[PDB]
């Protein structure tokens, strides 16, 4: 099923408390989806899927370009295909940038608002609010604000701290304000980016720790691994150890879904292209043929995630 | 958006009463679905999306392969697309014989009836039974139970009558049993399938008219024009002289979506393949990059079957 | 074996008498000049392989790139391979002009001419002096010193005479001086060239014939048909009728040696290419792999050739 | 120009005296012919072309498959060129077992010593007989005839000496009777064949040393280095330390000259394929356009093989 609200949270405290975490895997389509929640499944793990700014558009179609009705329109699509699969699929939205708050993040939150004050759930469990490219203090105001109104809608929020250098660089006071003016979940829980290339988390731990008055091991933050694409295996180990709850990936499960596809064009070049006057081969220039293996792949890609990130074998269904 | 059950009985009648056709493009995913939606309205056209058994089921990923959830996932993206769009969307399903009635368009149609029992419209606007491969009698005997399931639930039926041998052969019996047991529309709207390759269409309008005591030229059927693909562009207009209000169409636009894919792998084949030693170019496996092209390309090849069918320029919104 | 002058005149007089033609195929390798030989004797034909400017320059490699130096290669080469086969391969330069006689036919001329001198026969048996670009009475001033060098030689002469408007004009002056300037053979056998899209060729004939006190239904030249590729295989049969003994033949051999190299790379993209992280095949990177395969290919199209212009079944060697 | 049998001894004793090499590349054609000559110039260098078995049939064509007209064709191709280019070119046989001596090396040899009977120089200039499936006496009998028919016509005899087992088994006696057998060149010139993976080669050269009465670190055996393909180049340089004088290469330079071809059909895939009803594009099917590309890379490995042995700069003709 979807994560509720109440499992999503669960899912997050769960990898934090046992070093785990999942994969959050950037979807852009119906086969894309269907690829991410089998690899899940596959692995017997719960997971993320995440839709970009451009990823959100592209679901909207060349005709409309909009990014709220695209990824409206792959979380419904996910709901009805998630309802039938026995792990927890929370669904998220990626950098959303200050100028796109209003265009994306925001009418976002306010579908889900109005879902909870029905009585539903949100039709997102988590956003991400991208604040990197202004000043601290502006970041962490917004920040507040978005926080406030996510854990209203039963929404956990994603941000980005500290300044991009690619690769983010996060002060000691940076963690100590974002401590500060957001507390450490009491006001909603919220999930804070991280990079590596990777004791900047530890530091970050130990600072927001002092801060809260707690153990020097504790690990008040709930970070997400950003740009860790075919990343060092070690140094996934090593982000475990410092709280990271999510790992983001694209890059990787693009290449997995992209290569069959291929693959298929050139070994059946002259099926998929009418060649000396033939009229190529329906069998093989029909979509499903080529986009079942691209599917099939992409799934493969997403259970080694699971694997790697140690989430395998632990879905909060318990569906063994 | 979605056309509701009173502007899809309209488009039909419109397009009937002037001599015109939608095209009902076969889709089965996010991509193919927007492609279509975009085609339609770039020809100024009122369309129809359909998905087959095998496209619901590749809808549902290879992780369900449940023909229902397949068919309402698509469905419910397409809601949400189409609202964005100043033309109106018809939902069809395409052949369904008996044996798979109890797992395709009956639940499908029990979704519908609870929609509709709660003061909503139905998540399709037609449903296809084809019962080609039974006896006459037992395929109108089906009909009509389907029938007044749909009519009740605010669908369209479309059947499909006489024996497969490829074309459909349909004696004047066949036409006459059908008129009988279904009457002409006043028990709820049907549509009757035909193929060419013609005068049988006509003949089975005069056999019709006759039956009920209508003048020689009456054309009391909508007939839908199977196995169409890339047909004379003359088969067409005859076809539309005797009452086709929708042409299948699904091979056409499937080479035309696979088309610049495989266009899009060849000339970056040293991109989408990690080759002697490189790690390929992200860019071009980025599966937006070739699916953009994809999506274009079909919606291309839908304009040109709105023109053909000249249904392009006559949308019920009349947005000109 | 390769054709010594006396059967390269029998075999153009033979053909001119019984209105066939040869097939010249350009050449411009090791590889391609197999195709054509075995093409010929397939046929059961004597053929001609003739080198351009630019394939002979190709043939010298690119350390190299001198003209003399690879037809003369290439034609090494080929009195190898034709000693081989019971058919007669004759051995042809094509369009040459003004500002490369110094650097390709005159070289090549004086070779054949030292090998005479020994009592040997020339290495080639025609070259042709493309003098179209200058006035009429320039070309055939050259035209004539060159046949009569040529003809001292053992070695056929072919001209382009007229003007380059792509189609060749020559007028009925052009004609008539060509006969004035060259005589009807008698002087050494030379060639004319012409192309169609064809009366023209049939006038040129009455012109000569009046010219030389000839009955009007007499063939004084022997014409080569220049630009003829995927011509109408009934513009080959009006060319055949006016004199043609030659057909020269490049984009048609060069589309057929392709075309399975082509479908060897897409079929095999993963052998030819070391993907992701793997070494390639062996077997399928080997160039004979795909060349054999081009090889044969060309050689059809030579067989093809042959038919079309009444050749095949007719080698002088009689071998059947 | 083509190595005179004095020249080619004396690039073997130079290279033996100075601890290099000559890469000996397999050719099956005019292209790879003149990219293998190309090569050995852009590197200053003086080079070996060898002809297997099958690279010889596949030169004659699949209308003869006779290894003698290949080998004689492509050789006569070969001087033609060479003499063109200011650095040296051996011609080699390869690998030529019991059962195809009489139709290859044998034959080939007669060639050659009819042409020295006449006061001109051999057509190949080292052959190599593989014995290694044979008893190593038999095999020595028939190296001894062949040794003295050989140095008769001035060429020099590889030979394979052990069991093979893919990698080279010979041992101490082996070499003890090859010695015996053969001499140390006062009879003739001979090379032995090895492989690596190499002190071997070492106890192979104090074991010849000993026999002739030799100081320890003497080098009797010239060694060719078989199965080397992309090899340590690290155990090149210990393979350089024992007396390897030639390395053979076919493998590496097959990958160079098909891998871009492969490239020029994808990028250009609607240009040498007919494709949606179009004609395809001249420029790009016609094969010089590719294999230029094909030649161009073969020569930079074959460069790459000259720097890599050591024989790059130090041509015979100290052209530099
Ligand atoms: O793929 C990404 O989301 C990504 C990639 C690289 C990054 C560098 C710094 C900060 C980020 O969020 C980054 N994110
Ligand atoms: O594509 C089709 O739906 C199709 C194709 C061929 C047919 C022949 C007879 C009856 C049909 O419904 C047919 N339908
Ligand atoms: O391929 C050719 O040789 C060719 C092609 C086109 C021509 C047009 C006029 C005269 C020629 O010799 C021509 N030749
Ligand atoms: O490519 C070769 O010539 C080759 C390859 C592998 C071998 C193994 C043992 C002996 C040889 O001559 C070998 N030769
Ligand atoms: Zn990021
Ligand atoms: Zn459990
Ligand atoms: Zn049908
Ligand atoms: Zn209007
Ligand atoms: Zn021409
Ligand atoms: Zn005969
Ligand atoms: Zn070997
Ligand atoms: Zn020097």
């Known amino acids: 099923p979807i994560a ?89 939205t990626d950098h959303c940038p200050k100028d796109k708050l209003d265009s994306y993040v925001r009418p976002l939150l306010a579908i889900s608002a109005q879902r909870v004050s029905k009585g539903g759930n949100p039709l997102f469990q988590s956003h991400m609010w991208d604040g990197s490219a202004v000043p601290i203090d502006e970041n962490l105001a917004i920040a507040q604000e978005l926080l406030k109104a996510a854990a209203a809608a039963k929404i956990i929020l994603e941000i980005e701290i500290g300044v991009v250098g690619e690769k983010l660089y996060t002060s000691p006071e940076d963690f100590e ?81 992209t290569r069959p596809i291929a693959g298929h064009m050139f070994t059946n070049y002259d099926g998929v292209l009418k060649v000396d006057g033939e009229v190529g081969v329906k069998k093989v220039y029909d979509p499903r043929s080529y986009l079942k293996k691209a599917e099939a792949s992409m799934s493969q890609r997403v259970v080694q995630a699971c694997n790697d990130l140690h989430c395998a074998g632990k879905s909060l269904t318990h569906h063994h």
């Open 4 to 92: 509720t609200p109440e499992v999503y949270a669960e899912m997050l405290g769960q990898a934090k408390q046992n070093s785990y975490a999942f994969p959050a895997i950037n979807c852009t389509s119906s086969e894309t989806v269907n690829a991410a929640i089998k690899g899940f499944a596959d692995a017997g793990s719960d997971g993320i899927i995440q839709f970009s700014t451009g990823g959100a558009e592209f679901g909207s179609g060349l005709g409309v370009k909009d990014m709220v009705t695209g990824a409206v329109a792959l979380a419904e699509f996910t709901h009805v295909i998630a309802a039938k699969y026995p792990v927890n699929v929370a669904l998220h």
């Open 177 to 257: 304000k974002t401590i500060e003016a957001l507390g450490a979940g009491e006001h909603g829980k919220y999930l804070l980016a991280a990079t590596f290339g990777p004791d900047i988390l530890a530091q970050g731990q130990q600072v927001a720790a002092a801060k809260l008055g707690l153990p020097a091991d504790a690990k008040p933050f709930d970070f997400v691994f950003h740009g860790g694409s075919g990343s060092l295996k070690s140094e996934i180990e090593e982000a475990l150890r410092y709280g990271v709850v999510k790992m983001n990936v694209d890059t990787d499960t693009q290449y997995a879904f």
